[PDB]
Design a protein around this ligand. Structure first.
Ligand SMILES: *[C@@H]1O[C@H](CO)[C@@H](O[C@@H]2O[C@H](CO)[C@@H](O)[C@H](O)[C@H]2NC(C)=O)[C@H](O[C@@H]2O[C@@H](C)[C@@H](O)[C@@H](O)[C@@H]2O)[C@H]1NC(C)=O
Ligand SMILES: *[C@@H]1O[C@H](CO)[C@@H](O[C@@H]2O[C@H](CO)[C@@H](O)[C@H](O)[C@H]2NC(C)=O)[C@H](O[C@@H]2O[C@@H](C)[C@@H](O)[C@@H](O)[C@@H]2O)[C@H]1NC(C)=O
Ligand SMILES: *[C@@H]1O[C@H](CO)[C@@H](O[C@H]2O[C@H](CO)[C@@H](O)[C@H](O)[C@H]2NC(C)=O)[C@H](O[C@@H]2O[C@@H](C)[C@@H](O)[C@@H](O)[C@@H]2O)[C@H]1NC(C)=O
Ligand SMILES: *[C@@H]1O[C@H](CO)[C@@H](O[C@@H]2O[C@H](CO)[C@@H](O)[C@H](O)[C@H]2NC(C)=O)[C@H](O)[C@H]1NC(C)=O
Ligand SMILES: CO[C@@H]1[C@@H](O)[C@@H](O)[C@@H](CO)O[C@@H]1O
Ligand SMILES: CO[C@@H]1[C@@H](O)[C@@H](O)[C@@H](CO)O[C@@H]1O
Ligand SMILES: [Ca+2]
Ligand SMILES: [Ca+2]
Ligand SMILES: [Mn+2]
Ligand SMILES: [Mn+2]
Lengths: 237, 237
């Protein structure tokens, strides 16, 4: 059993995507996860985009877990350097039918009063109390307190290429971050047993958030645009 | 204990490098692992380049294993498409003071008569009986029959950027291959316990080979140039 989809770009009312909260598709084909009005990113924004259909990451009858690969390009533009941009974006896998969680440092995937499990790769731009230096790539399992972290320098407004791969046989989740204009390459990997944390069926997608009002800083914002996205998963059985 | 080095370019007769067999440094600063005469790569060639000093990957007193990162750029030019270029190049780790092994599909690191242990990342261009389609990246442990492989499309004559990282805590060896002109990204990873296969001290370097005479094809050749190379290893204790 193999499942896959590709998006060279995004159109309005894409039937394959489920948009939540502030997430919207612009006229020029980009998926804007967080609010941007008249070319300016705003604070107090949270948005998600999930692939409409659920994907099976493992089968309880055979015990087999799926291997998958996903590639996407994103762009984060930070117009206001002072005092600090926030908050970042993530690629995540969660149970089907979840609702947007808390914003700010929780990226819209963590809900304190009704926590659901999730695996996510974050591109964190704001340093919360639980964070190391930013920006950083992080692998998150059921929490925003990453199991592994690696710092990276953002190409402000530039295009970034990401490759996330999961090998079921080794349980290795490895991610690659490339900024073609700068020629920089960042890599991080960790062991994650999907079968142990997630249910057989899940939703895959993105989520992002800008500065929380409690920070009292309107400049704590940035864009979180997804330019393209392909996904492929193989479950033997 | 952190060792580190990097060659942004190669100088004729590098005191830091030990060249073996056909390996030579050209006038324009590139490390040519295999023979190239008058701008043309020849068959029946094998060459290696080892960092002159040994590096300690683990300590038997503490039991600690080192983590390391290495980045290098290479270029493989394939002048003759038919019938099949050969053979490829690898980055390897082996016991100190070893001699060049068999050529062809063994890349000059495997010696059937007197086999020594080794861990290597291959960029295989010729499909031997034990190989999956080519070209492919492969992780080799004591043998050229890779534990893991991933196919890739070569930018003929172009520049390739490689990042190899080993995290001792997870035993994950992950490699990234990027061809900046094509914008393509390839990734592969596997679990390798260095302490279990290699001695405390080792040599790190490259090795490559062109078509073996037994194949009776003079066209089975290509270049195997290394443009730059940095290495870093951190052994706590
Ligand atoms: C919030 O972002 C604003 C846009 O960058 C900041 O204003 C800009 O501040 C620059 C000095 O760092 C100055 O050169 C720009 O002209 C100005 N942009 C405009 C026209 O608004 C703002 O900085 C604060 O407010 C300005 C007016 C000054 O009083 C600064 O000293 C302040 O730091 C940012 N506010 C915060 C909380 O940093
Ligand atoms: C080895 O590579 C050579 C260069 O690519 C091949 O020869 C070239 O073949 C071209 C058509 O495939 C032809 O237009 C070129 O003139 C020729 N280049 C020269 C001057 O050698 C060669 O192909 C075979 O051997 C040559 C000598 C010719 O007889 C071709 O017709 C053959 O296909 C390659 N060797 C083999 C066996 O593939
Ligand atoms: C492939 O490359 C070999 C070098 O590693 C060539 O042989 C040379 O090495 C042998 C032993 O290591 C020496 O005894 C020879 O003197 C070297 N040959 C030369 C050019 O002097 C090898 O050449 C072939 O084998 C040797 C033994 C001779 O019979 C050559 O005439 C013959 O070409 C070369 N193979 C080919 C097919 O070119
Ligand atoms: C931050 O955004 C929330 C909504 O995302 C704001 O609350 C909403 O405010 C509008 C208009 O006042 C109401 O119609 C909604 O029902 C509110 N929803 C919520 C979340 O309660 C909130 O006021 C914003 N904070 C600030 C200070 O701008
Ligand atoms: C969860 O805490 C928030 C951070 O993640 C940022 O959004 C910051 C921006 O000012 O505001 C809050 O401190
Ligand atoms: C070990 O086998 C050899 C290959 O690795 C290539 O060198 C090929 C080139 O023609 O010749 C032999 O089949
Ligand atoms: Ca954060
Ligand atoms: Ca081969
Ligand atoms: Mn973080
Ligand atoms: Mn191979």
């Amino acid at each position: 059993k193999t499942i896959s989809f590709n998006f060279n770009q995004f159109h309005q009312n894409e039937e394959q995507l489920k948009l939540q909260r502030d997430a919207r598709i612009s006229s020029n084909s980009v998926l804007e996860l967080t609010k941007v009005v008249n070319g300016v990113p705003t604070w107090n924004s949270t948005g998600r985009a999930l692939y409409a259909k659920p994907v099976q990451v493992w089968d309880s009858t055979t015990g087999n877990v799926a291997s998958f690969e996903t590639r996407f390009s994103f762009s984060i533009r930070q117009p206001f350097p002072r005092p600090h941009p926030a908050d970042g974006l993530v690629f995540f896998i969660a149970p089907p039918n979840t609702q947007t969680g808390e914003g700010g440092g929780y990226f819209g995937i963590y809900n304190p009063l009704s926590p659901y499990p999730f695996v996510a790769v974050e591109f964190d731009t704001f340093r919360n109390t639980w964070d190391p230096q930013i920006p950083h790539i992080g692998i998150d399992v059921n929490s925003v307190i990453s199991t592994k972290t690696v710092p990276f320098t953002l190409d402000n407004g530039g295009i970034a290429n990401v490759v996330i791969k999961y090998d079921a046989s080794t349980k290795i989740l490895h991610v690659v971050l490339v900024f073609p204009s700068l020629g920089t390459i960042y890599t991080i990997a960790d062991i994650v047993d999907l079968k142990q944390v997630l249910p057989e069926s899940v939703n895959v997608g993105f989520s992002a958030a800008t500065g929380d009002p409690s920070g009292k800083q309107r400049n704590a914002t940035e864009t979180h645009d997804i330019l393209s996205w392909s996904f492929s998963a193989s479950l033997p059985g």
